Amino acid sequence: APVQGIINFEQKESNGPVKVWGSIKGLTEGLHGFHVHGAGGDLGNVTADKDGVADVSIEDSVISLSGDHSIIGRTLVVHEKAGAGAGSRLASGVIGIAQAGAGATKAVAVLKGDG
C-alpha cells in the first residue's frame, strides 16, 4: 500500500517499561490514532509531517512484551484517516518476536495498509 511502517518494541524486564519506536510513511498530514487492537494498548496519536512521515518514539508502562498483558501476537494499528474518533481505513501488522531471553525482549510490527 501507500501506507507502510516499521515499529519496534523493546523491554528489558518482565514488568519494565516498553520502548516503542520507528516510522510510518505514506500518511496524510496530521494526527493519526495509534494503538494495539483490543484492551490496554492505547499508544496515543502519531503526527505525520508534510511528507506524510510520522516518526515514533515513546515509552509506555501499560503495555508489556511478556505475561498475560503481552502484546506479542496482537495487531498494531494506525488510523489512515487523520484526526480523532473512529476510522475503518487501517494500516496494520501483527507484533512479532525479534529477540527473547533471558529477561529482555524485542518485537517488531510491519505496518501495511491498502491502496
Swiss-Prot record:
One of its GO terms (molecular function) is copper ion binding. Cu cation binds at H35, H37, H79. It is an enzyme of class 1 (oxidoreductase). It catalyses: 2 superoxide + 2 H(+) = H2O2 + O2. The modification Phosphoserine is found at S57, S61, S64, S66. Its cofactor is Cu cation; Zn(2+). Keywords: Acetylation, Amyotrophic lateral sclerosis, Antioxidant, Copper, Cytoplasm, Disease variant, Disulfide bond, Lipoprotein, Metal-binding, Neurodegeneration, Nucleus, Oxidoreductase, Palmitate, Phosphoprotein, Ubl conjugation, Zinc. Binds 1 copper ion per subunit. Binds 1 zinc ion per subunit. Gene3D superfamilies: Superoxide dismutase, copper/zinc binding domain. The modification N6-acetyllysine is found at K81. Changing G26R: In ALS1; mild form; ubiquitinated by RNF19A. Ubiquitinated by MARCHF5; leading to the degradation of mitochondrial SOD1. The modification N6-succinyllysine is found at K50, K81, K106, K112. Changing D49A: In ALS1; does not seem to be linked with a decrease in activity. Zn(2+) binds at D42. It is linked to Amyotrophic lateral sclerosis 1: A neurodegenerative disorder affecting upper motor neurons in the brain and lower motor neurons in the brain stem and spinal cord, resulting in fatal paralysis. Sensory abnormalities are absent. The pathologic hallmarks of the disease include pallor of the corticospinal tract due to loss of motor neurons, presence of ubiquitin-positive inclusions within surviving motor neurons, and deposition of pathologic aggregates. The etiology of amyotrophic lateral sclerosis is likely to be multifactorial, involving both genetic and environmental factors. Homodimer; non-disulfide-linked. Homodimerization may take place via the ditryptophan cross-link at Trp-21. Heterodimer with SOD1. The heterodimer CCS:SOD1 interacts with SLC31A1; this heterotrimer is Cu(1+)-mediated and its maintenance is regulated through SOD1 activation. Interacts with DAOA; the interaction is direct. This is Superoxide dismutase [Cu-Zn]. The lineage of its organism: Eukaryota, Metazoa, Chordata, Craniata, Vertebrata.
